[PDB]
């Protein structure tokens, strides 16, 4: 037995323009970055650097 | 020398965040500009025994 | 603006996008060249 849930909400217009967001590691963690050119998404990188 | 795409602005859309639909209010009055950079494409391959 | 029609029979939702033709065909030519490697 399936049914739906409907919510009626106010409909204001807002300005909408995506801002770059950076992710940063929590204490105890680090991010390894693959610096190989043309990495292709999987497998080994032979040039690895560490960033927060 | 300009490829022009025809576009429409819609109010009833499907949601990318989950199964369901949502209705949005009618469009704002005018001069709406969206200048942007194409930085990549998402393609799928149509193969098969044929 | 100057797109105020609301109905055809009983245009506010009409919009368009421009792409430089020469950039797009060049872009695809490079993509195609890479697809050909596979």
């Amino acid at each position, epitope marked *: 037995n399936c049914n739906t849930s*409907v919510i*009626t909400q*106010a*409909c204001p217009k807002v300005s909408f323009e995506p801002i770059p967001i950076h992710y940063c590691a929590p204490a105890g963690f680090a991010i390894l970055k693959c610096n190989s050119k043309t990495f292709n998404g999987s497998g080994p990188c032979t040039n690895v650097s560490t960033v927060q | 020398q300009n490829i022009t795409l025809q576009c*429409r*602005i*819609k*109010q*009833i*859309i499907n949601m990318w965040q989950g199964v369901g*639909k949502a*209705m949005y*209010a*009618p469009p704002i009055r005018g001069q709406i500009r969206c200048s942007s950079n194409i930085t990549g494409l998402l393609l799928t391959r149509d193969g098969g025994r044929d | 603006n100057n797109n105020t029609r*609301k*109905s055809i*029979h*009983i245009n506010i*939702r009409q919009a368009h996008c421009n792409i430089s033709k020469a950039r797009w065909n060049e872009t695809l030519g490079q993509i195609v060249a890479k697809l050909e490697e596979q």
Partner: antibody, heavy 127, light 110 residues
Framework: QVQLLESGAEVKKPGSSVKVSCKAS????????FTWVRQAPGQGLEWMGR????????HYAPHLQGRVTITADKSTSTVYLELRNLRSDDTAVYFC?????????????????????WGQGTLVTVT | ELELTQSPATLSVSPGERATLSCRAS??????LAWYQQKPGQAPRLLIY???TRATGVPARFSGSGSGAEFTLTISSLQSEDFAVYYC???????????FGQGTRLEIKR
């Protein structure tokens, strides 16, 4: 664009239910919204509620929802107004009205409330 | 929700006179107030779509405007066929809480 054809008059003992129908013709029912108006004698145009046929949702005047529901039967292009627990207070001439919405099927629905297409008016009383 | 009221209860005019009808909105409705014409035994047919667009089929005699708490409807060169009750309707509601005013009756001066 369309004409709306309503059911006839009815009388019920208070507490009984009454269902009023409004059939639309000349366009696709799904394409646009319908509302109901209650012309009680001596009164103005009390709003009953609104039903959207592209999305099966409805809204009701805030004092009436305990008694009234609206159903859009897309297969018969007919809207039904159901009055539960009918009171003598609800004696009135009821009718539907349609509002054209653009290309609702394509998701270009306007959500207009301006009533252009009207029914005839059916008196509902109690006994 | 928003209450709409008519200024005159009725308005007595002569045919050929310009009718001047008005409606007040207690919550400052914005460009969401429509006008309708109801004749006895008839549905209250739309005259003005939104605050100022006459609906298709509406005679050029009918026009109106307004904003916020006050809106008007006028009928130039009023004809005998226009002695109807005019209604005020508001749409600035979401969730919908649409309302109508009481209706102003035109009277034929006699």
């Amino acid at each position: 664009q369309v004409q709306l054809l309503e059911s006839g008059a009815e009388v019920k003992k208070p507490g009984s239910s009454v269902k009023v129908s409004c059939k639309a013709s000349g366009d696709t029912f799904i394409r646009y919204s319908f509302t109901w108006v209650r012309q009680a004698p001596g009164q103005g145009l009390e709003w009953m509620g609104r039903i959207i046929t592209i999305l099966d949702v409805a809204h009701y005047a805030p004092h009436l929802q305990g008694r009234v529901t609206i159903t859009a039967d897309k297969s018969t292009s007919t809207v039904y107004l159901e009055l539960r627990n009918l009171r003598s207070d609800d004696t009135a001439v009821y009718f539907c009205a349609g509002v054209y919405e653009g290309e609702a099927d394509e998701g270009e629905y306007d959500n207009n409330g301006f009533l252009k297409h009207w029914g005839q008016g059916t008196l509902v009383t109690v006994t | 929700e928003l209450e709409l009221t008519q200024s005159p209860a009725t308005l007595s005019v002569s045919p050929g006179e310009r009718a001047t009808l008005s409606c007040r909105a207690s919550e400052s409705v914005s460009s969401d107030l429509a006008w309708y014409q109801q004749k006895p035994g008839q549905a209250p047919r739309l005259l003005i779509y939104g605050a100022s667009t006459r609906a298709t089929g509406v005679p050029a005699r009918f026009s109106g405007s307004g904003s916020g708490a006050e809106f008007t409807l006028t009928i130039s060169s009023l004809q005998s066929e226009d002695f109807a009750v005019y209604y005020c309707q508001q749409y600035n509601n979401w969730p919908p809480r649409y309302t109508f005013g009481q209706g102003t009756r035109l009277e034929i001066k006699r």
